[PDB]
Amino acid sequence: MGGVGVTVPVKPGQNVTLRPQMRSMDNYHVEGDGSASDSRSFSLSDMEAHIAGGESLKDVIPNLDSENVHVRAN
Amino acid sequence: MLEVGYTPPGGGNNIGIIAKGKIRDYQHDREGGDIISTVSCGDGDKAYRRATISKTIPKGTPLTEVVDEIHKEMKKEGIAKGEWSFPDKVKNTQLKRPYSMCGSCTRELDTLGRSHGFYWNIQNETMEIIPGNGHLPGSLLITPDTGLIGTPTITDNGIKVKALINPEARPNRMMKVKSQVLKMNRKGEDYRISEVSFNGDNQEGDWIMTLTGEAIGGDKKVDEGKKAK
Amino acid sequence: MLEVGYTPPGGGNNIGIIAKGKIRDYQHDREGGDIISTVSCGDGDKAYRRATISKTIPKGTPLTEVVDEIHKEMKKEGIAKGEWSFPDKVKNTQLKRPYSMCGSCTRELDTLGRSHGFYWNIQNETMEIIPGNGHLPGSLLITPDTGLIGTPTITDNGIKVKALINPEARPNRMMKVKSQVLKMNRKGEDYRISEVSFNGDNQEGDWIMTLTGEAIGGDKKVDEGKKAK
Amino acid sequence: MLEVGYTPPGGGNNIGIIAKGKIRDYQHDREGGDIISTVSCGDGDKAYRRATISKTIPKGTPLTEVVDEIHKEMKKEGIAKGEWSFPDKVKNTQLKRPYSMCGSCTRELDTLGRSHGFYWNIQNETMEIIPGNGHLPGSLLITPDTGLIGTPTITDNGIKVKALINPEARPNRMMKVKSQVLKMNRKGEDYRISEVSFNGDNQEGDWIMTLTGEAIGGDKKVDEGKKAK
Amino acid sequence: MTGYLGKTTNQDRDVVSAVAQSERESVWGEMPGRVVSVSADGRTVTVQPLYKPKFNGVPTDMPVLQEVPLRQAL
Amino acid sequence: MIELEVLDESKQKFSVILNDRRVTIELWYNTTNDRWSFSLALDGDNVVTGRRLVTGVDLLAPFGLGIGALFLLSENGEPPTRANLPLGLVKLYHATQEEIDAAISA
Amino acid sequence: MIELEVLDESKQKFSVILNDRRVTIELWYNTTNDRWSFSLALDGDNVVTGRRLVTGVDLLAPFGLGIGALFLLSENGEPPTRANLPLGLVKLYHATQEEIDAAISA
Amino acid sequence: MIELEVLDESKQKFSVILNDRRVTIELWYNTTNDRWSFSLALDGDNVVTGRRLVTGVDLLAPFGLGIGALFLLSENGEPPTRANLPLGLVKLYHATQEEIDAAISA
């Protein structure tokens, strides 16, 4: 939030969760002043990637600390 | 273009455009051996399918400059500008936050109308805009001495009147209707025009049009009817 | 109120309410010179529009107190309480987790029905509830000696019987139908009432009603028919 | 099974299946005292309801093996395999990621069609697939000397031809239509078959079938018609 | 919304927007929930979400959601 | 309160919404004692059966059905008869509990 | 540019899309001076009323309506008359601003 | 297995669902050798053309079409003739592969 927050080093091969938006933000991202091109809803070109929600339960993330808040770098 | 009207032995020409057509679908037909060509046409059909806009729009912008903006895109698709009369609440409104536009122009045109209740329509390649409770200048007389068939039919809000197709009648205008029925029916004379129906034949079925109007009140406003959320 | 019935020269009065009306839309009509006033009315139509509820509801609460709760809001709009007969699975169910209600009453009434497979309806400003496979008490006889017209027409589940309008016939009741044809059709006599149709006239078109019923089995349960997910 | 055809005093049998039926709904009817049984049936109607698939798919899989896998589940519900003629873009395409399959087979069947515009359909418990602009082998002659009623009715893309029901006519095939009208109408002879209509009677209303075809171009492709996004 | 004008001459518009409205109900979205149990492998949680949809005009409860993939910000 | 019409039929049945419940009332004449009797069903369930119509008392009081008072009146306190009840010389009335309370307080 | 047909009636009215605007024109003949006059309404509002139809000048120039030029022409510069305007001896034309610019440049 | 009806026509065509495939069969009589012949098309594609109808052998064995066995039978092993095939003195049969396996195992 304003740059002030937490970060995770994203590398080619990790898993994200993609979420579409109600409407697109073509030139809300190309110009900041907030509006896209024509007038749609819910386009596949409106996906943002978030760090939580992508991995599969088959593939196990080891050593999940359950009692103490844990911050990982590996 | 579909020209309809009356061409009496004396008089002159009464023929005007009642529908300017972009062909929808055609098909021939036997009846015995005949060949009847059944046309369906298009009104704004270029804009209902190939009009797509491109817009970032900033804060502080008035509430009509971008109706001009959207009409730019529908003008790329051959639409003329009609009369635009917004609500007074609309004319004076300004902005706090930016205005996505990406996708279907008619789609978010409709969400406009539902956003705060104005009508917009396309009338022979021409786009008109009115308020929900308003109408546009222009009046037309309909009386047994000026084209009235049967009763002026009474409805909850206004009337439904049949007449001979005679081309002035456009949606979003005014009809002054007189008869020997409306008087004892205690109904006004001025109505907006909302629905228009043209049915006719060259040989047998007379030119017939039917107009539905929602009555104008004392305050110069249309009796909207209870909009249900 | 639309009261229909038979008033024979002797006998007495058979007139009762077949539809209690909140006016939907009216419109006069000339045919020659006539004026026919075509009315459409409203059935629970104040509740289908203006009924909105406000509910926090906690865990542990039984599964009917809040049909009373929803009927509180539906009663603010002038709806009466009919017979409620829930499924046995419903009568005995309790709660683990809390029960949102924000928005439109009829909308999530429908989700109610789709979610526990039960029927609810409004019958002349009175709201009844039944199970999908059940019906309500009250039986009505239809025979060639008691107002039968043609077949007790047979269907997949039950029957569709025409008769002279004679007011008792309500949805969610039982009709015992007899003829000389059903016997060789092996079709039963008791049927729930699901659809009711009233068509009639004062001069020529006699009073006619048509009732669609889904047959009750030997188990005292209705032949539901295969619900397709 | 509904067998229709002609059984002339000489000749022989022309009777074939024009619809194989899974009963939809039936109902008897008097007209006087008659009893007409109005049947409605089902076409792949066990697959439109009870067919649900179970599928993980890995990367790299060709673009037809899982039409076979979906046909596995449709075949569990009693569907046969017809001719599958995929688009060329389809036959050669491969993959990058995994292909969710959970819910309704017909649902994501339709999304297939919308995903690259190919047609799939069920024809008397048989499943066929064609491209949007393609057709399947098999031809039928329709002439005033081979079963033509009226003109070959001309349409934007192709024709709509009436004839005597005579059972070859199946969707996704070819009809070669000749007349004394189409020549001055410059309309070709070969058309795909897209719509099939059968209407007829045993006594009075003869067998009539109507076929809608979208014309094949010089390049052996169908005039798709402007698909609208 | 259902019945803009009345009883049984229900406009074709009403009985189509009603289908759209019902199918718009049917979709799921967010909702708050209470954790019931946490799997030992630390990625799936037994959740008793705090929402009941509307049943028989009354609270019924949709059951404890099982093997719900827990999603840490990793 | 309301007046409930009575037909000139020795056995008749009707339905009315009393306190927003559908109440079905069945009247039948008993010739041997020359008296009218009513059965009452609340929304399809028969709750009162075979009660005699008598003037000047609340007929539903014993049952606590929650549908108000159902009472009969006549100018000079006659009893209801085959002839006199349909003619309107004796009138059947339904009074809501709030109305009864207001009259008692007034 | 385009030619706008004129009927043989002392008062006539029509509508045309000029520069994508719905322009309604009303022509009426003044017998006392024997001259044609026009009122112009843009989208329902009367912006010009009672203007004399004169040959060889742009009739809309003073107003800056933004709908091009509307001008009358005749072979030898005759003036418009009750008879000679409907007969096509004097023709009413609409020219778009781009066309006027191109001709002026050419 | 099933029996495939044969009409009394020198050339006939029908369609059947064999192992859930659309199999279009065209039978035609060759008078010069007085013998019947069949073409088989799978789902619109002509896969077999001009084969002789002979009794006592599987007619589709060489092709591996995967649509079962199609064979003729007669009481005393007569060959199929213009008259004998439509009359049912020689019968055309389709046997599914599982049925063939079960009989061979039995």
PDB file of all heavy atoms in Angstrom, chain C residues 20 24 41 49 63 66-67 95-99 107 118, chain E residues 4-7 25 49-52 54 56-57 59 61:
ATOM      1  N   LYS C  20     -58.632 -12.082  -6.848  1.00  0.00           N
ATOM      2  CA  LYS C  20     -58.714 -10.785  -6.169  1.00  0.00           C
ATOM      3  C   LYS C  20     -57.616  -9.889  -6.740  1.00  0.00           C
ATOM      4  O   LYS C  20     -56.434 -10.233  -6.696  1.00  0.00           O
ATOM      5  CB  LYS C  20     -58.591 -10.933  -4.661  1.00  0.00           C
ATOM      6  CG  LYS C  20     -58.661  -9.621  -3.929  1.00  0.00           C
ATOM      7  CD  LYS C  20     -58.825  -9.819  -2.438  1.00  0.00           C
ATOM      8  CE  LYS C  20     -59.006  -8.491  -1.733  1.00  0.00           C
ATOM      9  NZ  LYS C  20     -59.348  -8.651  -0.292  1.00  0.00           N
ATOM     10  N   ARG C  24     -53.347  -4.199 -12.760  1.00  0.00           N
ATOM     11  CA  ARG C  24     -52.089  -4.209 -13.487  1.00  0.00           C
ATOM     12  C   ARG C  24     -52.016  -3.193 -14.608  1.00  0.00           C
ATOM     13  O   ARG C  24     -51.014  -2.481 -14.714  1.00  0.00           O
ATOM     14  CB  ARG C  24     -51.839  -5.604 -14.079  1.00  0.00           C
ATOM     15  CG  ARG C  24     -50.769  -5.674 -15.123  1.00  0.00           C
ATOM     16  CD  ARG C  24     -50.284  -7.086 -15.345  1.00  0.00           C
ATOM     17  NE  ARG C  24     -48.939  -7.089 -15.903  1.00  0.00           N
ATOM     18  CZ  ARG C  24     -48.002  -7.983 -15.624  1.00  0.00           C
ATOM     19  NH1 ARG C  24     -48.241  -9.011 -14.827  1.00  0.00           N
ATOM     20  NH2 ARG C  24     -46.791  -7.835 -16.149  1.00  0.00           N
ATOM     21  N   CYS C  41     -54.797  -7.413 -13.640  1.00  0.00           N
ATOM     22  CA  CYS C  41     -54.728  -7.172 -12.205  1.00  0.00           C
ATOM     23  C   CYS C  41     -53.399  -7.663 -11.633  1.00  0.00           C
ATOM     24  O   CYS C  41     -52.525  -8.127 -12.366  1.00  0.00           O
ATOM     25  CB  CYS C  41     -55.885  -7.873 -11.489  1.00  0.00           C
ATOM     26  SG  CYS C  41     -57.536  -7.302 -11.929  1.00  0.00           S
ATOM     27  N   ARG C  49     -43.146  -6.719  -5.550  1.00  0.00           N
ATOM     28  CA  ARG C  49     -42.359  -5.526  -5.815  1.00  0.00           C
ATOM     29  C   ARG C  49     -41.823  -4.842  -4.566  1.00  0.00           C
ATOM     30  O   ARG C  49     -40.612  -4.630  -4.469  1.00  0.00           O
ATOM     31  CB  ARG C  49     -43.187  -4.498  -6.593  1.00  0.00           C
ATOM     32  CG  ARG C  49     -43.937  -4.980  -7.814  1.00  0.00           C
ATOM     33  CD  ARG C  49     -44.763  -3.811  -8.322  1.00  0.00           C
ATOM     34  NE  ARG C  49     -45.795  -4.150  -9.291  1.00  0.00           N
ATOM     35  CZ  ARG C  49     -46.648  -3.264  -9.787  1.00  0.00           C
ATOM     36  NH1 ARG C  49     -46.574  -1.982  -9.472  1.00  0.00           N
ATOM     37  NH2 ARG C  49     -47.605  -3.674 -10.610  1.00  0.00           N
ATOM     38  N   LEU C  63     -36.498 -24.115  11.650  1.00  0.00           N
ATOM     39  CA  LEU C  63     -36.544 -23.843  10.222  1.00  0.00           C
ATOM     40  C   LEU C  63     -37.904 -23.317   9.754  1.00  0.00           C
ATOM     41  O   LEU C  63     -38.211 -23.422   8.565  1.00  0.00           O
ATOM     42  CB  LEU C  63     -36.145 -25.113   9.466  1.00  0.00           C
ATOM     43  CG  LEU C  63     -36.017 -25.082   7.941  1.00  0.00           C
ATOM     44  CD1 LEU C  63     -35.091 -23.991   7.507  1.00  0.00           C
ATOM     45  CD2 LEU C  63     -35.464 -26.400   7.442  1.00  0.00           C
ATOM     46  N   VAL C  66     -38.782 -18.370  10.621  1.00  0.00           N
ATOM     47  CA  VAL C  66     -38.389 -17.290   9.729  1.00  0.00           C
ATOM     48  C   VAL C  66     -39.216 -17.314   8.449  1.00  0.00           C
ATOM     49  O   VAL C  66     -39.225 -16.338   7.689  1.00  0.00           O
ATOM     50  CB  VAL C  66     -36.877 -17.355   9.485  1.00  0.00           C
ATOM     51  CG1 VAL C  66     -36.399 -16.225   8.587  1.00  0.00           C
ATOM     52  CG2 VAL C  66     -36.162 -17.309  10.842  1.00  0.00           C
ATOM     53  N   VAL C  67     -39.973 -18.388   8.212  1.00  0.00           N
ATOM     54  CA  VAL C  67     -41.068 -18.226   7.271  1.00  0.00           C
ATOM     55  C   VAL C  67     -42.031 -17.248   7.886  1.00  0.00           C
ATOM     56  O   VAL C  67     -42.566 -16.373   7.200  1.00  0.00           O
ATOM     57  CB  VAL C  67     -41.778 -19.549   6.918  1.00  0.00           C
ATOM     58  CG1 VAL C  67     -42.718 -19.338   5.745  1.00  0.00           C
ATOM     59  CG2 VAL C  67     -40.802 -20.597   6.559  1.00  0.00           C
ATOM     60  N   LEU C  95     -29.402 -25.625  12.890  1.00  0.00           N
ATOM     61  CA  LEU C  95     -28.483 -24.709  12.231  1.00  0.00           C
ATOM     62  C   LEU C  95     -27.072 -24.767  12.801  1.00  0.00           C
ATOM     63  O   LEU C  95     -26.880 -24.894  14.015  1.00  0.00           O
ATOM     64  CB  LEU C  95     -29.017 -23.293  12.375  1.00  0.00           C
ATOM     65  CG  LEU C  95     -30.487 -23.133  12.033  1.00  0.00           C
ATOM     66  CD1 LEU C  95     -30.775 -21.683  12.202  1.00  0.00           C
ATOM     67  CD2 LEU C  95     -30.840 -23.611  10.631  1.00  0.00           C
ATOM     68  N   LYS C  96     -26.091 -24.634  11.904  1.00  0.00           N
ATOM     69  CA  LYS C  96     -24.683 -24.583  12.269  1.00  0.00           C
ATOM     70  C   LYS C  96     -24.083 -23.186  12.077  1.00  0.00           C
ATOM     71  O   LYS C  96     -23.150 -22.816  12.796  1.00  0.00           O
ATOM     72  CB  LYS C  96     -23.946 -25.615  11.413  1.00  0.00           C
ATOM     73  CG  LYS C  96     -24.349 -27.051  11.741  1.00  0.00           C
ATOM     74  CD  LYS C  96     -23.521 -28.105  10.999  1.00  0.00           C
ATOM     75  CE  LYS C  96     -23.929 -28.174   9.522  1.00  0.00           C
ATOM     76  NZ  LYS C  96     -23.235 -29.262   8.768  1.00  0.00           N
ATOM     77  N   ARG C  97     -24.607 -22.397  11.114  1.00  0.00           N
ATOM     78  CA  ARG C  97     -23.972 -21.201  10.544  1.00  0.00           C
ATOM     79  C   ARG C  97     -24.994 -20.127  10.172  1.00  0.00           C
ATOM     80  O   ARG C  97     -26.028 -20.507   9.648  1.00  0.00           O
ATOM     81  CB  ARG C  97     -23.196 -21.626   9.298  1.00  0.00           C
ATOM     82  CG  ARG C  97     -24.156 -22.196   8.248  1.00  0.00           C
ATOM     83  CD  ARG C  97     -23.590 -22.711   6.920  1.00  0.00           C
ATOM     84  NE  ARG C  97     -23.031 -21.700   6.033  1.00  0.00           N
ATOM     85  CZ  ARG C  97     -22.265 -21.979   4.985  1.00  0.00           C
ATOM     86  NH1 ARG C  97     -21.808 -23.200   4.768  1.00  0.00           N
ATOM     87  NH2 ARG C  97     -21.994 -21.014   4.109  1.00  0.00           N
ATOM     88  N   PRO C  98     -24.720 -18.813  10.303  1.00  0.00           N
ATOM     89  CA  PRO C  98     -25.778 -17.777  10.135  1.00  0.00           C
ATOM     90  C   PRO C  98     -26.281 -17.409   8.731  1.00  0.00           C
ATOM     91  O   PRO C  98     -25.607 -17.664   7.731  1.00  0.00           O
ATOM     92  CB  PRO C  98     -25.225 -16.567  10.904  1.00  0.00           C
ATOM     93  CG  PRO C  98     -24.125 -17.117  11.734  1.00  0.00           C
ATOM     94  CD  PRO C  98     -23.531 -18.217  10.934  1.00  0.00           C
ATOM     95  N   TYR C  99     -27.454 -16.760   8.672  1.00  0.00           N
ATOM     96  CA  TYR C  99     -28.363 -16.826   7.513  1.00  0.00           C
ATOM     97  C   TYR C  99     -28.611 -15.488   6.821  1.00  0.00           C
ATOM     98  O   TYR C  99     -29.686 -14.910   6.976  1.00  0.00           O
ATOM     99  CB  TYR C  99     -29.604 -17.275   8.030  1.00  0.00           C
ATOM    100  CG  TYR C  99     -30.751 -17.528   7.074  1.00  0.00           C
ATOM    101  CD1 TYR C  99     -30.791 -18.662   6.266  1.00  0.00           C
ATOM    102  CD2 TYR C  99     -31.805 -16.659   7.015  1.00  0.00           C
ATOM    103  CE1 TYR C  99     -31.846 -18.931   5.444  1.00  0.00           C
ATOM    104  CE2 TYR C  99     -32.887 -16.914   6.180  1.00  0.00           C
ATOM    105  CZ  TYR C  99     -32.883 -18.052   5.391  1.00  0.00           C
ATOM    106  OH  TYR C  99     -33.902 -18.382   4.547  1.00  0.00           O
ATOM    107  N   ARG C 107     -37.107 -13.025  -4.831  1.00  0.00           N
ATOM    108  CA  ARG C 107     -35.908 -13.641  -5.376  1.00  0.00           C
ATOM    109  C   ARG C 107     -35.388 -14.743  -4.470  1.00  0.00           C
ATOM    110  O   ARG C 107     -35.228 -15.904  -4.908  1.00  0.00           O
ATOM    111  CB  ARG C 107     -34.841 -12.557  -5.575  1.00  0.00           C
ATOM    112  CG  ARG C 107     -33.599 -12.981  -6.335  1.00  0.00           C
ATOM    113  CD  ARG C 107     -32.570 -11.856  -6.399  1.00  0.00           C
ATOM    114  NE  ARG C 107     -31.420 -12.193  -7.233  1.00  0.00           N
ATOM    115  CZ  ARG C 107     -30.409 -11.369  -7.480  1.00  0.00           C
ATOM    116  NH1 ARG C 107     -30.390 -10.136  -7.002  1.00  0.00           N
ATOM    117  NH2 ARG C 107     -29.394 -11.792  -8.227  1.00  0.00           N
ATOM    118  N   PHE C 118     -39.587 -27.255  -2.346  1.00  0.00           N
ATOM    119  CA  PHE C 118     -40.942 -27.089  -1.852  1.00  0.00           C
ATOM    120  C   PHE C 118     -41.594 -26.007  -2.693  1.00  0.00           C
ATOM    121  O   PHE C 118     -40.917 -25.222  -3.357  1.00  0.00           O
ATOM    122  CB  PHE C 118     -40.995 -26.660  -0.391  1.00  0.00           C
ATOM    123  CG  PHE C 118     -40.426 -25.302  -0.150  1.00  0.00           C
ATOM    124  CD1 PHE C 118     -41.270 -24.205  -0.152  1.00  0.00           C
ATOM    125  CD2 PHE C 118     -39.087 -25.110   0.123  1.00  0.00           C
ATOM    126  CE1 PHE C 118     -40.793 -22.945   0.075  1.00  0.00           C
ATOM    127  CE2 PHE C 118     -38.602 -23.836   0.340  1.00  0.00           C
ATOM    128  CZ  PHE C 118     -39.467 -22.756   0.325  1.00  0.00           C
TER     129      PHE C 118
ATOM    130  N   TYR E   4     -43.785  -6.513 -12.595  1.00  0.00           N
ATOM    131  CA  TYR E   4     -43.799  -5.056 -12.560  1.00  0.00           C
ATOM    132  C   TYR E   4     -45.213  -4.506 -12.652  1.00  0.00           C
ATOM    133  O   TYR E   4     -45.464  -3.371 -12.237  1.00  0.00           O
ATOM    134  CB  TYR E   4     -42.942  -4.449 -13.679  1.00  0.00           C
ATOM    135  CG  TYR E   4     -41.458  -4.613 -13.477  1.00  0.00           C
ATOM    136  CD1 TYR E   4     -40.965  -5.352 -12.418  1.00  0.00           C
ATOM    137  CD2 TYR E   4     -40.551  -3.949 -14.287  1.00  0.00           C
ATOM    138  CE1 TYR E   4     -39.622  -5.483 -12.212  1.00  0.00           C
ATOM    139  CE2 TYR E   4     -39.193  -4.069 -14.079  1.00  0.00           C
ATOM    140  CZ  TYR E   4     -38.732  -4.838 -13.036  1.00  0.00           C
ATOM    141  OH  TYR E   4     -37.380  -4.972 -12.812  1.00  0.00           O
ATOM    142  N   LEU E   5     -46.144  -5.282 -13.198  1.00  0.00           N
ATOM    143  CA  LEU E   5     -47.489  -4.765 -13.387  1.00  0.00           C
ATOM    144  C   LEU E   5     -48.606  -5.685 -12.862  1.00  0.00           C
ATOM    145  O   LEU E   5     -49.647  -5.161 -12.470  1.00  0.00           O
ATOM    146  CB  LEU E   5     -47.697  -4.388 -14.866  1.00  0.00           C
ATOM    147  CG  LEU E   5     -46.699  -3.427 -15.536  1.00  0.00           C
ATOM    148  CD1 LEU E   5     -47.059  -3.239 -16.999  1.00  0.00           C
ATOM    149  CD2 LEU E   5     -46.645  -2.067 -14.855  1.00  0.00           C
ATOM    150  N   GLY E   6     -48.432  -7.013 -12.770  1.00  0.00           N
ATOM    151  CA  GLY E   6     -49.481  -7.772 -12.086  1.00  0.00           C
ATOM    152  C   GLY E   6     -49.625  -9.289 -12.170  1.00  0.00           C
ATOM    153  O   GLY E   6     -48.646 -10.018 -12.369  1.00  0.00           O
ATOM    154  N   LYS E   7     -50.880  -9.761 -12.047  1.00  0.00           N
ATOM    155  CA  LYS E   7     -51.155 -11.129 -11.604  1.00  0.00           C
ATOM    156  C   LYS E   7     -50.531 -12.168 -12.512  1.00  0.00           C
ATOM    157  O   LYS E   7     -49.594 -12.879 -12.133  1.00  0.00           O
ATOM    158  CB  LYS E   7     -52.661 -11.425 -11.609  1.00  0.00           C
ATOM    159  CG  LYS E   7     -53.557 -10.816 -10.594  1.00  0.00           C
ATOM    160  CD  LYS E   7     -54.946 -11.420 -10.670  1.00  0.00           C
ATOM    161  CE  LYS E   7     -55.815 -10.799  -9.618  1.00  0.00           C
ATOM    162  NZ  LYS E   7     -55.343 -11.138  -8.238  1.00  0.00           N
ATOM    163  N   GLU E  25     -28.638 -15.140  -8.783  1.00  0.00           N
ATOM    164  CA  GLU E  25     -28.573 -15.692  -7.438  1.00  0.00           C
ATOM    165  C   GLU E  25     -27.632 -16.876  -7.364  1.00  0.00           C
ATOM    166  O   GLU E  25     -26.763 -16.912  -6.488  1.00  0.00           O
ATOM    167  CB  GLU E  25     -29.926 -16.218  -6.941  1.00  0.00           C
ATOM    168  CG  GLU E  25     -31.155 -15.352  -7.083  1.00  0.00           C
ATOM    169  CD  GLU E  25     -32.417 -16.177  -6.861  1.00  0.00           C
ATOM    170  OE1 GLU E  25     -32.284 -17.393  -6.615  1.00  0.00           O
ATOM    171  OE2 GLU E  25     -33.536 -15.641  -6.967  1.00  0.00           O
ATOM    172  N   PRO E  49     -18.749 -22.090   7.019  1.00  0.00           N
ATOM    173  CA  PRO E  49     -18.846 -20.674   6.667  1.00  0.00           C
ATOM    174  C   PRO E  49     -20.073 -20.068   7.327  1.00  0.00           C
ATOM    175  O   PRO E  49     -21.065 -20.751   7.583  1.00  0.00           O
ATOM    176  CB  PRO E  49     -18.959 -20.682   5.140  1.00  0.00           C
ATOM    177  CG  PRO E  49     -18.492 -22.031   4.706  1.00  0.00           C
ATOM    178  CD  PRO E  49     -18.734 -22.968   5.839  1.00  0.00           C
ATOM    179  N   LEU E  50     -20.003 -18.765   7.598  1.00  0.00           N
ATOM    180  CA  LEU E  50     -20.996 -18.099   8.429  1.00  0.00           C
ATOM    181  C   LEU E  50     -22.250 -17.705   7.664  1.00  0.00           C
ATOM    182  O   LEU E  50     -23.163 -17.113   8.246  1.00  0.00           O
ATOM    183  CB  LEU E  50     -20.386 -16.853   9.074  1.00  0.00           C
ATOM    184  CG  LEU E  50     -19.249 -17.122  10.056  1.00  0.00           C
ATOM    185  CD1 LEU E  50     -18.536 -15.837  10.383  1.00  0.00           C
ATOM    186  CD2 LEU E  50     -19.788 -17.777  11.325  1.00  0.00           C
ATOM    187  N   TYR E  51     -22.306 -18.012   6.381  1.00  0.00           N
ATOM    188  CA  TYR E  51     -23.462 -17.694   5.561  1.00  0.00           C
ATOM    189  C   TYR E  51     -24.384 -18.894   5.399  1.00  0.00           C
ATOM    190  O   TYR E  51     -23.928 -20.008   5.143  1.00  0.00           O
ATOM    191  CB  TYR E  51     -22.969 -17.220   4.202  1.00  0.00           C
ATOM    192  CG  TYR E  51     -24.039 -16.818   3.248  1.00  0.00           C
ATOM    193  CD1 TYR E  51     -24.310 -15.499   2.971  1.00  0.00           C
ATOM    194  CD2 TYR E  51     -24.739 -17.790   2.560  1.00  0.00           C
ATOM    195  CE1 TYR E  51     -25.281 -15.169   2.062  1.00  0.00           C
ATOM    196  CE2 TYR E  51     -25.697 -17.475   1.663  1.00  0.00           C
ATOM    197  CZ  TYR E  51     -25.984 -16.173   1.418  1.00  0.00           C
ATOM    198  OH  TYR E  51     -26.968 -15.911   0.495  1.00  0.00           O
ATOM    199  N   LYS E  52     -25.692 -18.669   5.531  1.00  0.00           N
ATOM    200  CA  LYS E  52     -26.694 -19.624   5.055  1.00  0.00           C
ATOM    201  C   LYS E  52     -27.377 -18.879   3.919  1.00  0.00           C
ATOM    202  O   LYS E  52     -27.761 -17.714   4.088  1.00  0.00           O
ATOM    203  CB  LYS E  52     -27.778 -19.962   6.072  1.00  0.00           C
ATOM    204  CG  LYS E  52     -27.366 -20.306   7.463  1.00  0.00           C
ATOM    205  CD  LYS E  52     -28.632 -20.155   8.398  1.00  0.00           C
ATOM    206  CE  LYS E  52     -28.401 -19.919   9.947  1.00  0.00           C
ATOM    207  NZ  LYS E  52     -29.309 -19.055  10.787  1.00  0.00           N
ATOM    208  N   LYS E  54     -30.888 -18.631   1.525  1.00  0.00           N
ATOM    209  CA  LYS E  54     -32.250 -18.577   2.035  1.00  0.00           C
ATOM    210  C   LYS E  54     -32.922 -19.907   1.688  1.00  0.00           C
ATOM    211  O   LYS E  54     -32.983 -20.328   0.531  1.00  0.00           O
ATOM    212  CB  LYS E  54     -32.969 -17.345   1.478  1.00  0.00           C
ATOM    213  CG  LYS E  54     -34.115 -16.897   2.360  1.00  0.00           C
ATOM    214  CD  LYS E  54     -35.085 -15.961   1.703  1.00  0.00           C
ATOM    215  CE  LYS E  54     -34.549 -14.562   1.678  1.00  0.00           C
ATOM    216  NZ  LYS E  54     -35.620 -13.716   1.118  1.00  0.00           N
ATOM    217  N   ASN E  56     -36.419 -22.419   2.703  1.00  0.00           N
ATOM    218  CA  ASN E  56     -37.745 -22.549   3.322  1.00  0.00           C
ATOM    219  C   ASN E  56     -38.072 -21.333   4.172  1.00  0.00           C
ATOM    220  O   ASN E  56     -38.460 -21.440   5.334  1.00  0.00           O
ATOM    221  CB  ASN E  56     -37.859 -23.842   4.121  1.00  0.00           C
ATOM    222  CG  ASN E  56     -38.448 -24.958   3.300  1.00  0.00           C
ATOM    223  OD1 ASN E  56     -39.538 -24.813   2.749  1.00  0.00           O
ATOM    224  ND2 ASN E  56     -37.713 -26.047   3.152  1.00  0.00           N
ATOM    225  N   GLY E  57     -37.881 -20.170   3.571  1.00  0.00           N
ATOM    226  CA  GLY E  57     -38.060 -18.898   4.229  1.00  0.00           C
ATOM    227  C   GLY E  57     -37.268 -18.751   5.502  1.00  0.00           C
ATOM    228  O   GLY E  57     -37.491 -17.796   6.251  1.00  0.00           O
ATOM    229  N   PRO E  59     -33.570 -19.963   8.111  1.00  0.00           N
ATOM    230  CA  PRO E  59     -32.294 -20.653   8.266  1.00  0.00           C
ATOM    231  C   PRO E  59     -32.384 -22.153   8.057  1.00  0.00           C
ATOM    232  O   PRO E  59     -32.985 -22.872   8.853  1.00  0.00           O
ATOM    233  CB  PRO E  59     -31.936 -20.350   9.706  1.00  0.00           C
ATOM    234  CG  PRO E  59     -32.558 -19.026   9.995  1.00  0.00           C
ATOM    235  CD  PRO E  59     -33.611 -18.759   8.956  1.00  0.00           C
ATOM    236  N   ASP E  61     -28.844 -24.772   7.027  1.00  0.00           N
ATOM    237  CA  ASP E  61     -27.413 -24.563   6.915  1.00  0.00           C
ATOM    238  C   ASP E  61     -26.787 -25.513   5.910  1.00  0.00           C
ATOM    239  O   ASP E  61     -26.954 -26.734   5.979  1.00  0.00           O
ATOM    240  CB  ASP E  61     -26.725 -24.685   8.267  1.00  0.00           C
ATOM    241  CG  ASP E  61     -27.157 -23.603   9.207  1.00  0.00           C
ATOM    242  OD1 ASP E  61     -27.782 -22.659   8.734  1.00  0.00           O
ATOM    243  OD2 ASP E  61     -26.788 -23.615  10.387  1.00  0.00           O
TER     244      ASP E  61
END
